[PDB]
A paper describes a structure:
IgG antibodies are responsible for antibody-dependent cell-mediated cytotoxicity, antibody-dependent cellular phagocytosis and complement activation, functions mediated through binding of the Fc region to Fcγ receptors and C1q, respectively. The Fc region comprises a dimer of CH2 and CH3 domains that are linked to the two Fab fragments through the hinge region, and an oligosaccharide moiety covalently attached to the CH2 domain at position 297. The oligosaccharide not only orients the CH2 domains but affects Fcγ receptor binding and complement activation, and therefore plays an important role in influencing IgG effector function. In IgG1, the FG loop conformation is conserved, but in IgG4 it adopts a different, unique conformation, consistent with the anti-inflammatory properties of this subclass.
The asymmetric unit of the deglycosylated IgG4-Fc (degly-Fc)* structure contains two interlocked Fc molecules related to one another by a pseudo-symmetric two-fold rotation. The deglycosylated IgG4-Fc structure that we report here also adopts an open CH2 domain conformation, dictated by the interlocked nature of the Fc molecules in the asymmetric unit, with a Pro329-Pro329 Cα distance of 29.1 Å. Asn297 is deamidated to Asp through the action of PNGase F, and in chains A, C and D, the Asp297 side chain adopts different rotamer positions compared with Asn297 in glycosylated IgG-Fc. On the other hand, in chain C of the degly-Fc structure, although residues Lys326, Gly327 and the side chain of Leu328 are disordered, the positions of residues Pro329 and Ser330 are more akin to those of the unique IgG4 FG loop conformation. Thus, to form the hexamer interface, a structural change occurs in the CH2 AB loop, in which residues Ile253 and Ser254 move away from the CH2 domain.
Residue numbers in the entry:
A (entry chain D): 235 to 443
B (entry chain C): 237 to 325, 328 to 443
The structure:
C-alpha cells in the first residue's frame, strides 16, 4: 500500500570498536508526501526512551517526496552488550506508527586469528609486490583492517568482504601493494585488525623480509 | 502482476568446452486464472528458437513459476552478444536483456602462498591462492591434489582494484599432517583472458 517507508541502520563496525570515533544508529524515512510532511521520532534503548537524538530537516527528493533522517549516538559498550535499539516513526502519510528494532549480531563471539603472508617469489619480478594479511575464524562479521609502517598509515590496500566458513565463522584477506624497493630494503609492515573478540578489541601482526 | 528475471550463464560453463552454458528466463507470480505464458528469445536482435521451456510449477503462494532456458554458444557470450527475453502473459509484454561485461580482458596473475608458521600450532592449515589483475570479474577457482579434487576451500568474491581490474583470494584448508608430509597442492584458475582458458600453480612444502 501507499505511504512512507522506514529503515534502521546499525553503526559502522569501525566506529563501534574505536573509542575515538562515534557509533550511530540511524533511522531514515523515505517517500514522505508533500501533503503531509511532518514527521516525529521516538527512540528506545531496551524499552527505555532516550531523547539525545538529532533529527535533520526534511530533504526534498527529485520526485517531490521527502527524506527525513534521525540519528542516535550510541555507547560502544552498550551496542556490544547486545542492547536493543528501537525507532518509532509517526506520520500522517502512514496508517499507524511503525516501529523498527536493530541490535548487535547474536551468537558466541570468536577471536580472529591473524597471519601475515610474504609476497610470492614469482611476484618479485613485477615492479610492486603484494603483502597479504589473513584474518580467520572470527564471529561476528563486524571487523576492521588497516595497515601501518613506521607509525604512519599505509593507504594503498584493499580488503575482501567477510566470507562465511564451514564452522560458522568468517574469514577475509587484506592486500597491501608496496613498491618492491621498500620491501627489499627490509621495511616492517604491520597489519592492524580490530574486532570485539580480540583482547582490548585490537591486535597487530608485523611482516618483513 | 508477474515479474521477470534473466540470469547469465555460469562462468565455468562459458570457459570449459566440456560444459554447456545457458541463459535462464524466470517468470514468477503467475495468477492461477492465467497460466498461459509464451517466450521469445533474441540474440543481437535476431530471434532464435532453440530454447526449452519447463512446465508451470505451482507455488505455496497459489501463484505459478515458469522457467525458460536457452543454450548459448561459448564464443558468442565471450564476444559480448546480447541475449534478450520477451515474456507475454494481452498487449503487455515485459523485456529483459543481458550480455557480457563491456571492456578489454586482462589476464590474471596467480600466486600460491604457504601457511604462516604461526598457523602450524593448529590442527589444520591454510593454503592461500592469490589471483589478481584480471578483467572482467567472470572467473572460476578450484583445487586439486595428486590429481584428485579438493573440496574444503572457500573463495572470496572478486574485489575491484585501483587499476580497474579485480582480485580475489582462495583458501584451501588441509590437515597439518597432509601438508607436513610434503603433499603437492595446486591452484587452478579459469579465465577468458588465459591461454586455453586455464592455468595452474603448484604449492607444497
Amino acid at each position: 500500500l501507499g505511504g512512507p517507508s522506514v529503515f534502521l541502520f546499525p553503526p559502522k563496525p569501525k566506529d563501534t570498536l574505536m573509542i575515538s570515533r562515534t557509533p550511530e544508529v540511524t533511522c531514515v524515512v523515505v517517500d514522505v508526501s508533500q501533503e503531509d510532511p511532518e514527521v516525529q521520532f521516538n527512540w528506545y534503548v531496551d524499552g527505555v526512551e532516550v531523547h539525545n537524538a538529532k533529527t535533520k530537516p526534511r530533504e526534498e527528493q527529485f520526485d517531490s517526496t521527502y527524506r527525513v533522517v534521525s540519528v542516535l549516538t550510541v555507547l560502544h559498550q552498550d551496542w556490544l552488550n547486545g542492547k536493543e535499539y528501537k525507532c518509532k516513526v509517526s506520520n500522517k502519510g502512514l496508517p499507524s506508527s511503525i516501529e523498527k528494532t536493530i541490535s548487535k549480531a547474536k551468537g558466541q563471539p570468536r577471536e580472529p586469528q591473524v597471519y601475515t603472508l610474504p609476497p610470492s617469489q614469482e611476484e618479485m619480478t613485477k615492479n610492486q609486490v603484494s603483502l597479504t594479511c589473513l584474518v580467520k575464524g572470527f564471529y561476528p562479521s563486524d571487523i576492521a583492517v588497516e595497515w601501518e609502517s613506521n607509525g604512519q598509515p599505509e593507504n594503498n590496500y584493499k580488503t575482501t568482504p567477510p566470507v562465511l566458513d564451514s564452522d560458522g565463522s568468517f574469514f577475509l584477506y587484506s592486500r597491501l601493494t608496496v613498491d618492491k624497493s621498500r620491501w627489499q630494503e627490509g621495511n616492517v609492515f604491520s597489519c592492524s585488525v580490530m574486532h570485539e573478540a580480540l583482547h582490548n578489541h585490537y591486535t597487530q601482526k608485523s611482516l618483513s623480509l
